[PDB]
Design a protein around this nucleic acid. Structure first.
Lengths: 26, 99, 129, 22, 141, 149
RNA sequence: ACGGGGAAUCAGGGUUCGAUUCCGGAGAGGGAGCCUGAGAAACGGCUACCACAUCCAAGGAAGGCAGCAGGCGCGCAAAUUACCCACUCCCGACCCGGGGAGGUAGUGACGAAAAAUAACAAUACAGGACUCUUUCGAGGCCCUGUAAUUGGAAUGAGUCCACUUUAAAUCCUUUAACGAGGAUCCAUUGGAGGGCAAGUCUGGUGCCAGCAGCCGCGGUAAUUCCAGCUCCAAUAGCGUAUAUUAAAGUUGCUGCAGUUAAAAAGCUCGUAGUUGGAUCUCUCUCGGCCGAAGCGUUUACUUUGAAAAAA
RNA sequence: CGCAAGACGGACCAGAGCGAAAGCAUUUGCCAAGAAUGUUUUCAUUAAUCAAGAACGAAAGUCGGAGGUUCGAAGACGAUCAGAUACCGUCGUAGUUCCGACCAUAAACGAUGCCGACCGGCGAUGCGGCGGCGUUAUUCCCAUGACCCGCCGGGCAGCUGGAAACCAAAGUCUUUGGGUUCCGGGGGGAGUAUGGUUGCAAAGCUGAAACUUAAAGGAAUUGACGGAAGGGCACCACC
């Protein structure tokens, strides 16, 4: 959960944006 | 969007209002939309009152006044700083400035 | 002009109840209006009302309880058959537990439950709940 | 383009076309 | 507002049928001009003869070359540009061999960055392009 | 509101609830009828007859004392106009505006108002032809409008 | 555009489709005219034209598959020149003859139904499971499987037997002989960034090749291309392309919207159209509760009653 | 100091009035019309909206006839700027004025169809009517006009459900149906082509498609910028 949060907030709109938000809680 | 509820003019319940000419540019502006001032000044400025009063033949002459009705288009009235742009809330105020 | 005075009566009642008023003046009165109000009052939605008689077209002062969520007219008065009444109450009523559709039928003006009991179809006047 | 001048150019084109047509 | 009268059925129906012609899909499906302008003539696939190979430049935000083929349909003799889908599949295609060509999936609308290409090659020389791509079959001798 | 003007006025008479003959009125029903016949012989339309009776002799409503409306009484004995009073006045107004239009052909407001008056006349004539107050071939036409007034 | 019965969603309302086996109609290459006959403007009848076309000794003669099969052609697009009157029925002078009507096999994913590709270890393990006395310790009391060391039992896919089946018959069904441990008797199709289920693992490529319905990936550390591994979705089925339905309350009757997003006619008269205020509770016959007989002012209505093919 | 022409109707002039809208401002007279109010008058459903049809319709423009005062498309010159043949200045022809005939279009706008109900409050204002203490004006017996305070009816406004801006209507809408007319269906192509019709002409009305595109657009937030305003500041700014 923390790793997903870190990946999302590193680049909140980059290539890894939709996937991380979906992986958060879905 | 609609900036003003009266469209910046005083035309209600009529179709056409005769236009007048701005005193600066001679632009055709409707008489209700135009910005109208009524200057009532002394024909002699307050600096030149003493000389003409001293040189006056008639004691207690009370010097006359210049009455001028000035019409301004919105552009010329903005440029001449007679009116200024106001905030969205202060726009609605219609009270003339206290002076 | 003023057509379908039942629409005006029901709209006035609805607006007066939205404002929380205790009494509403309906004018002009009519036989259909009085029958509709009576059907309303038998179910406790509207309470007593009084017909003021002026010599041209009566008025009605209707007392109001806060029991009416909505009273509405259906225009035009569609001819509803008894087999097609279930669809009409599915469209118009909030649930099957409460709410009424008023039909004007050959047996008089009455709710949809009475029209089903009396096995009479008719023309839909309105609804209330 | 301004719409008024777009319409003016369209009208001029139509006038030229109808001149070319007899 | 809309007319609500017991005898307005003619007015309601006429208004509905007149207003339907302002709908894009209804007009394109019923006016008939879209069917005539359709290269396939209303079909789902079409067989054509490859006039030539060609490379089209993709739309600006992304850059590549799409290996399409200009073919001529057998049924109506129209000229079509059909996108050879995969990589190395243009090598499977030669000049002047019949190809079965389908739509691109958007009903005459161009697909993706490819400009003005609404067709894709499905089969070449009577053998599917997928079979050639996966090595299941070879080009007939 | 008005059928040809944007205005919507509430002004009109308000008959009281009581339909009885008033206390102040000693003038019996037959005397009221006799006064009605005399007024109509003087050449007064039912509206003017009612105005005069209400103002001078004093009657709340002639229908309350005599049981019949003034025009109905006049028809019963028979002194009523050939064509109805309101239609005749509308035709007279149309004739007046038409006569004004001859020497004022530049008056384009009079033309609009004449069109409105003629539309009112046509509506009223259609209604009257429906109820047999007019013959079915009764037409309003400018060439003969002054023949009716 | 042959019409209908009817077919594809079920919220309700609806929107499309109906060449197609049932009922009507129409036609037999396009027109037309006829003979016979109860019945035809018949074409597996004729006559003559128009278009095609077959033999010829060149004098003439013979034609009509939108019957059944088959060819050619067209196209994205559709079956073998099979056997039979045994069933259904039809025709005939007939209990007996005939029927490409029709039946029965042949042709694979039109599609629909049911339904295999496996069910059970000593074994160490990551575990846990009723008061576990110990992190170093009963774990066929309960269950998943990394498995180059395993075992018996079951069975049909298949090939053959008995000719049940059927008008000889291949078909399911039945009985039997073989038929399984990489049960090699080996399941595929499409995907793994979001929508939308499932890897920022490895290698290659370096805005190229390509992917991508849409948004977007690719410009040497690509979650997206090309492959390997792994995984998920359906599963003997999955992808794709057009058409179409729901989604679409983006056609709005239910049920849309029109100040500024697309939109109210410049304005007002106006006929057709649509809509329209209150108001009405020995007339009549067999036996001192009966068929007949109704102009109640005709209706729209509601609710019964016959009539609305079968599938 | 006069004289002559045309044009125009300042100040009074207002979120005031009238008109269907376009539009309408010097006095007086004539002609015809109109709303609102008052009405214990009359008729007694005669009504609302409208395909077709019809009246009117700023400016510009067209065709005839008067007059060219001003302004002034076109045009001719005169001016820092890289370049006006643009903005500026001087002239200036059609037009601008009136009379007939056309034209029928405007951001013709309240970007809000018309008719009918219901739905808060307030203070004004225009017209009519009603009621009332008082102050003013026509001889000292009154109304009435001008004020003052209220009331009622109609009117242009003002103040204080929506995406929101905002709207007492753009409210009484998933609790969806008062009546009726016109009208919209992603953005372009395009109000284009063509056909019909109207017109002297300009052009008006009605009006596509192929094709192309994943946005265009609305309201509002935050920033950045503004040869936008207000207030401050700096010798890396000036004086």
């Amino acid at each position: 959960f923390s790793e997903w949060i870190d990946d999302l907030e590193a680049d909140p709109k980059g290539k890894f944006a939709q996937n991380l938000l979906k992986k958060l809680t879905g | 969007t609609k900036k003003r509820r009266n469209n910046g003019r005083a035309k209600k319940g009529r179709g056409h209002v005769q236009p007048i000419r701005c005193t600066n540019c001679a632009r055709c502006v409707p008489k209700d939309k135009a910005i109208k001032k009524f200057v009532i000044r002394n024909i002699v400025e307050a600096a030149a009152v003493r000389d003409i009063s001293e040189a006056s033949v008639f004691d207690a002459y009370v010097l006359p006044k210049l009455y001028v009705k000035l019409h301004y288009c919105v552009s010329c009235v903005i440029h001449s700083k007679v009116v200024r742009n106001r905030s969205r809330e202060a726009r609605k105020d219609r009270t003339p400035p206290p002076r | 002009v003023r057509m379908n005075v039942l629409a005006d009566a029901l709209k006035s009642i609805n607006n007066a109840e939205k404002r929380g008023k205790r009494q509403v003046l309906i004018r002009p009165c009519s036989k259909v209006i009085v029958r509709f109000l009576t059907v309303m009052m038998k179910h406790g939605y509207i309470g007593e009302f009084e017909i003021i008689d002026d010599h041209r077209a009566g008025k009605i002062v209707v007392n109001l309880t806060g029991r009416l969520n909505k009273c509405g007219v259906i225009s035009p008065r569609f001819d509803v058959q008894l087999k097609d009444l279930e669809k009409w109450q599915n469209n118009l009523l909030p649930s099957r537990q409460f709410g009424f559709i008023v039909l004007t039928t050959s047996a008089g003006i009455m709710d949809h439950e009475e029209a089903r009991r009396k096995h009479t179809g008719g023309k839909i006047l309105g609804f209330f709940f | 383009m301004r719409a008024k001048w777009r319409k003016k150019r369209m009208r001029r084109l139509k006038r030229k076309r109808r001149k070319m047509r007899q | 507002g809309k007319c609500r009268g017991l005898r307005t059925a003619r007015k309601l129906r006429s208004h509905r049928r007149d207003q339907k012609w302002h709908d894009k899909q209804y007009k394109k499906a019923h006016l008939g001009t879209a069917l005539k302008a359709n290269p396939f003539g209303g079909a789902s696939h079409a067989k054509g003869i490859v006039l030539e190979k060609v490379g089209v430049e993709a739309k600006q935000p992304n850059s590549a070359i799409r290996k399409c083929v200009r073919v001529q349909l057998i049924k109506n003799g129209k000229k079509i540009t059909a996108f050879v889908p995969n990589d190395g599949c243009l090598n499977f295609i030669e000049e002047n061999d019949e190809v079965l060509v389908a739509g691109f999936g958007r009903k005459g609308h161009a697909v993706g960055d490819i400009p003005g290409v609404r067709f894709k090659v499905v089969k070449v020389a009577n053998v599917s392009l997928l079979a050639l791509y996966k090595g299941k079959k070879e080009r007939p001798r | 509101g008005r059928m040809h003007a944007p205005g919507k006025g509430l002004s009109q008479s308000a008959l009281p609830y009581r339909r009885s003959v008033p206390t102040w009125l000693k003038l019996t029903s037959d005397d009221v009828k006799e006064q009605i016949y005399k007024l109509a012989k003087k050449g007064l339309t039912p509206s003017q007859i009612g105005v005069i009776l209400r103002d001078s002799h004093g009657v709340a409503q002639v229908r309350f004392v005599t049981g019949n409306k003034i025009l109905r009484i006049l028809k019963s004995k028979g002194l009523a106009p050939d064509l109805p009073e309101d239609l005749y006045h509308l035709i007279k107004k149309a004739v007046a505006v038409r006569k004004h239009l001859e020497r004022n052909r530049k008056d384009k407001d009079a033309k609009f108002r004449l069109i409105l008056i003629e539309s009112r006349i046509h509506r009223l004539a259609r209604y009257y032809k429906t109820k047999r107050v007019l013959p079915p071939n009764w037409k309003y036409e400018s060439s003969t409008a002054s023949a009716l007034v």
